[PDB]
Design a protein around this ligand. Structure first.
Ligand SMILES: [Mg+2]
Ligand SMILES: [Mg+2]
Ligand SMILES: [Mg+2]
Ligand SMILES: [Mg+2]
Ligand SMILES: [Mg+2]
Lengths: 171, 72, 197, 137, 234, 191
RNA sequence: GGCCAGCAUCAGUUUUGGUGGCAGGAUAAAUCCAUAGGAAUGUAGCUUGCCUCGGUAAGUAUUAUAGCCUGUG
RNA sequence: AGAACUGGCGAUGCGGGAUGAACCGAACGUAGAGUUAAGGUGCCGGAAUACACGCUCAUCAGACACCACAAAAGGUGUUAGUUCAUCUAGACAGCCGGACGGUGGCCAUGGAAGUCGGAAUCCGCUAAGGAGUGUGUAACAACUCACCGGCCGAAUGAACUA
RNA sequence: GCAGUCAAGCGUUAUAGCGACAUUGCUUUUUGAUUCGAUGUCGGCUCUUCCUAUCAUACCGAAGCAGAAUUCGGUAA
RNA sequence: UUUGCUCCACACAAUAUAGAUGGAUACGAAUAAGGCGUCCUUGUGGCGUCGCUGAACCAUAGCAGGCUAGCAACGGUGCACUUGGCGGAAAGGCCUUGGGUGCUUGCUGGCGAAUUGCAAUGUCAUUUUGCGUGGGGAUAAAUCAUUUGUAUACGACUUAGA
């Protein structure tokens, strides 16, 4: 759905003579907190030898975009499940929010790579500070000074079955 | 300009059910072969990522800290 | 909203036009379609000619006069597309199909009537630029229709007469607009402008 | 007359400073300014005078107007409002027949039954005058 | 997809990398310290035997060729990057196929040799025509009338497509011999030549132009000055 | 990739006027006028001055930009045709039967008539396309010259003349008779 | 009093609108204001090359006769 | 194919999968109202020619059972990626010039000079130039490219993956 | 077919194991010499149509294709 | 086949069933372009303006629309005649001259409405194979039977006969 970003902090259950277990924090993109905690436990089991029944969730907090109304360039480092193994992939998305960039990336992976949410792993979303570090042409073509482009062949939506004039596609 | 006969695309029930049975047999044979075979069983940072130097410096700092974390 | 809706078939896509016309006929609207030879089918001319030749292949083996009947006229091709979307073997389907007339060109009395278009079926609004499309008159001539030249000549004569009519109408409209503009400063005009008219 | 001539075919351009009219959503019927271009299909718009929030929007939800004013790229809400007030976009918009047509449509929708009767009477009077004038010429 | 496919050839020689340019750079910068006079020579369209004869004549000195940009970088592009004082003028005076002559011999001797050195050469395009060449009517011979036809061998039949198409000369094959219907004028004396006429003259073997080395200037190590020679720069 | 905008330039010399409206290009020069219909390609023409005309594609792909370059080449060829012309020289050769090439008038149509090709009794006829002129070269043996402002028309006429004399059922290593395009160039030879 | 209906006030089930008061989060993030730094897809100003009476092509210049970004409050 | 266990069907209608012994929903008194399941909403046909991001043009696409044809084979179709390289002391193409000397290296042949063959395949001068990549000659000649340079000026090539 | 060889890939940090394209040996040796068990369903006459996986006729491409003739291949029922 | 047949006006009469209930309101062409207005040196011309839906335009007040008194203007509109032109794709329609005869809500007045009882489509629009009135217009053919054989199983076909 419309993605949100959470931080999930968890730990192992405290045992005898081993108090204050180490706290581990992850940034998860998910539609709701149930999915966020599920993804957190999945990745924690995949990385460390901690299970859901053996650990606990200490905190889960939604992180909002710092400047949601500023146009930004994001470099997205991801990897996807394959038979040969994990394969890295780097994408560049121009958007105003990390969650919007993540949603765009998931739609792109579904459209092109035929990939799914549980197969795509989000490793890093990083804002590109300087425009000289952008290295994809489909993003760089929108960084040109005084960029103007038209929208030829405008198609207007009709609310009636029949029209009494030949339509025009001017704009 | 003589057009030939076109192959039909209407689904046959008997063919579909036979394909289902053939697929189940194939899956069982694949599972058996995967259990029976004797065959021996981390790409890292992509080169197009901008902050590769930052990632490498962070992992070097983590290694340097964790080398002494367990020692003392 | 009209008792009879006359559709100028030029520039329309045949399947979408057939869909909307069939729905209108089943809902109970009387429809007349003109200029069926100017209809369009998306895809290349040889693709659509290949499809029509597959249709021509279809025929009853023991008696060809019993089999599918391959009507070559563009209006008949459009009628085939429409009958494929109307359940024509029932009384309701027959009653719906008897509310439809299709013609090549614009014969009288429809040559002096208002003609409308269907935006959801227009090629310039639906097809992406660069996509190929076929003209139904050329397809019909290629598959056996023999009246493309007569239709063209009659349409040219009708266009000459219609152009003369429109020149007279435009002159009268300019005169009417000039007569209406000189009363724009009257108090009645000011009150109508305040009321939105 | 030995000069080349090429038709122009003027298009409204997606650019910083282009004034757009929102046709669907929460802010339907209001004006906004294109602050920054995001990509081929989305832009960043700001509508501080009419109350339109600064937002990323799809170009399929707005219609480009012929009006355009000077505005720096990525301008914040205060700068956009200041430039909008200086350029007087609202007055130039209201001067156009497009906004006049919208206003006429809204007034006709707001008319009552008695006002429709008055419209009929005034239309008959104007029709009598216009027909008498047109009979002579 | 839909891209040009590179031709693959199985030869013995590989392309030179950055190491060759660095070696040339180091050799130039060492010769600058070793020798006293550095001369700038223009040697466009030089033949390798002529260049080797010049190298043999200038025994005890060094002649270095290569990329003009590499040589200029070795000499120093600007005043803050020059390898020696007042070397930017010598670097900026270089042009085209430039050779650097590191030597210790007398300036008068160098100027005398480069003024008195002259060799016959093929006539290059964009140059004044050295003679008027007319292929005579009839059977085309290898020299094209420069030597008598009784001494000359007829032109080989394999060159007829080349003369007909590339050289745009109306030729026919009669009994395995190249023939023309009318005499063919190729060039008029005192006219700028193009690639086709230069190729025709080269094919017939006429070498009437003269090759002379151009001398731009020289730099003196102790004097730290540059003086323009202006030899064969007419 | 869907490039935002891709453009090409067309340079117009001093004596040439180009008028374009709804993708109908008219090019006028000293040698005459040419007309082209480019309504099958979605491009936008723009004039920046009397010496340069740009043609552009907005938000297009590989096929669209290839068509853009093709359009630039076609307009350049029209300008070249009206300012210099096109001249194709062909030679006809034979071994035993001399090929006879003449200009004949059948109902005012200007056919090129070819006779005695490999001893054939058939009379071959190639119509002359409108706008091209046929000349038999002086002081050059068995040479035809086709001149005109349309490179397409001149080249197609030359190709038709070449293909009307195909050798059938014979070894072409041995039988060398035919009419072949020998040179292509411009009518004007000022420099 | 037999047949068919209309309206009003209720009861049970349900469907579709308008509007009010509260509570949580980074006690939303934003916007806005103030303040300190910064750079270019470099605003004003200046210099040169020569350009249709100054419109530009390239250097300088961090707010100026436009602005923007980040941190803090 | 042989064993263990568990589900469905025969004895069972209803909705959907166009149609159906084992597929997807759901089991059944007679009715009214509401909401749904599975499956769907261009027309046949009740229900958005809805909204949004991408991909694809097939000289019989596809709207399928995920088994086979199927070699993850072939393609100068298209898109997105991965890893190596080259690069203003000059990216890819293009044009022009150079492409040398011992030497016509030895044997062999009527002839064989880099280019019919058999074995060596070196040295010098270079910016670079094979005891030669091909065309060509009876042998030579001539052209070419391996390689280098001049002009041009900004990105480009290769191999894999989807 | 059986047995073996090579290695573009696959697999791996234990030069194990799979493995495309190629290739060898037997069948099968050198001078163009000199019929062997269908255990249960076959063929006609008259007459129509269909497939193309084309023998001929039509048009093409290649080949030491001179001509003549022929071979291989393409579109085509 | 007890005056049959057909239209022209006037009465009475019944009638209007895939679904009237203000009006189906006429350029062509393009859509990476157009429409309208204006000007000139008439074009692939210059200048201005319009689109972003018909949410329009025209019509629309009066016992389902009555009876009368004026004012202003010489307009609008219905009907029966009348003058002329055009339209053959299935024209059966479009424009137009003249007088006559009604209405006019362009503006100002005076009378009438009731009880259909608080709603019940509450019936309103062309054609009329029916009659009566009447002024005019015109007085056939086919088949069976007989006959021919250019035809034929029978029907049919093709001939002939006041
Ligand atoms: Mg209730
Ligand atoms: Mg429906
Ligand atoms: Mg098969
Ligand atoms: Mg075949
Ligand atoms: Mg009244």
């Amino acid at each position: 759905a419309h993605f949100k970003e959470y931080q999930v902090i968890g730990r192992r259950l405290p045992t005898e003579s081993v108090p204050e277990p180490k706290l581990f924090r992850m940034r998860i993109f998910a539609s709701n907190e149930v999915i966020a905690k599920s993804r957190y436990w999945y990745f924690l089991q995949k990385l460390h030898k901690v299970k859901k029944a053996s650990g606990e969730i200490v905190s889960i907090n939604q992180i909002n975009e710092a400047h949601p109304t500023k146009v930004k360039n994001f470099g997205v480092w991801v990897r996807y499940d394959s038979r040969s193994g994990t394969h890295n992939m780097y994408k560049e998305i121009r958007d105003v929010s990390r969650v919007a960039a993540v949603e765009t990336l998931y739609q792109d992976m579904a459209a092109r790579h035929r990939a799914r949410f549980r197969s795509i792993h989000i490793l890093k979303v990083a804002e590109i500070e300087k425009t000289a570090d952008v290295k994809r042409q489909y993003v760089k073509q929108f960084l040109t000074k005084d960029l103007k482009f038209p929208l030829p062949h405008r198609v207007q939506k009709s609310t009636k079955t029949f029209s009494y004039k030949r339509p025009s596609t001017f704009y | 300009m003589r057009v030939r006969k076109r192959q039909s695309r209407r689904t046959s029930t008997k063919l579909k059910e036979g394909i289902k049975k053939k697929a189940s047999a194939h899956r069982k044979k694949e599972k058996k072969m995967a259990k029976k075979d004797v065959t021996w069983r981390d790409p890292g940072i992509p080169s197009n990522f901008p902050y590769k130097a930052k990632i490498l410096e962070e992992i070097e700092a983590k290694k340097m800290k964790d080398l002494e974390e367990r020692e003392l | 909203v009209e008792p009879v809706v006359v559709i100028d078939g030029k520039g329309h896509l045949v399947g979408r036009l057939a869909s909307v016309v069939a729905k209108q006929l089943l809902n109970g609207q009387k429809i007349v379609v003109v200029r069926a030879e100017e209809l369009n089918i998306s895809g290349e001319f040889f693709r659509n000619k290949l499809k029509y030749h597959d249709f021509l292949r279809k025929a009853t083996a023991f008696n060809k006069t019993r089999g599918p009947f391959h009507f070559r006229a563009p209006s008949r091709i459009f009628y085939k597309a429409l009958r494929g979307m109307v359940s024509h073997k029932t009384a309701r389907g027959k009653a719906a199909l008897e509310r439809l007339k299709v013609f090549e060109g614009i014969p009288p009395p429809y040559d002096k009537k208002k003609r409308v278009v269907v935006p959801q079926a227009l090629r310039v609004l639906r097809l992406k630029p660069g996509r190929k499309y076929t003209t139904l008159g050329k397809l019909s001539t290629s598959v056996g229709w023999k009246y493309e030249d007569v239709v063209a000549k009659l349409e040219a004569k009708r266009k000459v007469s219609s152009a003369e009519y429109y020149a007279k109408k435009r002159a009268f409209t300019k005169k009417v607009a000039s007569a209406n503009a000189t009363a724009a400063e009257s108090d009645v005009a000011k009150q109508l402008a305040a009321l939105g008219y | 007359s030995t000069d080349s001539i090429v038709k122009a075919s003027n298009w409204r351009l997606v650019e910083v400073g282009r004034v757009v009219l929102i046709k669907k959503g929460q802010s339907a019927g209001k004006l906004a300014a294109i602050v920054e271009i995001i990509d081929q299909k989305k832009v960043l718009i700001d509508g501080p005078k009419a109350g339109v929030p600064r937002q990323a929007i799809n170009l399929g939800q707005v219609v480009l107007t012929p009006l355009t004013f000077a505005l720096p790229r990525g301008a914040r809400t205060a700068t956009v409002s200041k430039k909008w007030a200086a350029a007087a976009v609202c007055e130039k918009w209201a001067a156009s027949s497009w906004a006049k047509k919208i206003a006429q449509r809204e007034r006709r929708a707001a008319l009552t039954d008695f006002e429709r009767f008055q419209v009929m009477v005034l239309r008959k009077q104007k029709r009598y005058t216009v027909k008498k004038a047109l009979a002579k010429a | 997809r839909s891209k040009r496919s590179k031709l693959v050839t199985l030869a013995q020689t590989d392309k030179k990398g950055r190491e060759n340019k660095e070696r040339i750079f180091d050799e130039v910068r060492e010769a600058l310290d070793t020798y006293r006079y550095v001369w700038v020579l223009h040697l466009d369209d030089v033949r390798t035997p002529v260049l080797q004869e010049i190298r043999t004549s200038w025994a005890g000195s060094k002649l270095i060729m290569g990329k003009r940009k590499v040589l200029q970088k070795a000499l120093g592009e600007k005043r803050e990057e020059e390898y020696k004082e007042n070397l930017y003028q010598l670097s900026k005076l270089c042009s085209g196929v430039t050779g650097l002559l590191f030597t210790d011999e007398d300036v008068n001797t160098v100027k005398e040799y480069f003024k008195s050195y002259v060799r016959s050469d093929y006539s290059r395009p964009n140059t004044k025509a050295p003679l008027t060449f007319t292929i005579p009517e009839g059977i085309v011979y290898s020299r094209g009338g420069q030597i008598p036809a009784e001494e000359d061998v007829p032109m080989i039949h394999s060159l007829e497509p080349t003369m007909r198409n590339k050289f745009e000369i109306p030729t026919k094959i009669k009994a395995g011999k190249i023939t023309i219907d009318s005499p063919y004028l190729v060039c008029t004396e005192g006219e700028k030549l193009d690639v086709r006429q230069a190729l025709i003259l080269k094919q017939f073997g006429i070498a009437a132009s003269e090759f002379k080395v151009k001398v731009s200037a020289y730099y003196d190590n102790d004097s730290s000055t540059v003086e323009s020679t202006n030899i064969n720069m007419e | 990739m869907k490039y935002i905008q891709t453009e090409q330039q067309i340079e117009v010399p001093e004596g040439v006027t180009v008028s374009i409206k709804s993708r109908i290009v008219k090019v006028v020069g000293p040698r005459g006028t040419l007309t082209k219909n480019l309504k099958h390609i979605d491009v936008t023409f723009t004039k920046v001055n009397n010496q340069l005309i740009k043609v552009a594609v907005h938000n297009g792909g590989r096929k669209h930009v290839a068509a853009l370059r093709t359009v630039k080449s076609l307009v350049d060829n029209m300008i070249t045709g009206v300012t210099k012309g096109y001249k194709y020289k062909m030679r006809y050769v034979y071994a035993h039967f001399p090929i006879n090439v003449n200009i004949v008038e059948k109902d005012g149509a200007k056919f090129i008539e070819v006779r005695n090709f490999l001893g054939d009794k058939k009379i071959r006829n190639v119509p002359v396309r409108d706008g091209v002129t046929i000349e038999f070269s002086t002081n050059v043996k068995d040479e035809i010259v086709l001149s005109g402002n349309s490179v397409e028309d001149v080249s197609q006429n030359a190709a038709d003349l070449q293909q009307i004399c195909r050798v059938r059922n014979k070894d072409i290593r041995k039988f060398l008779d035919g009419i072949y395009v020998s040179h292509k160039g411009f009518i004007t030879e000022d420099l």
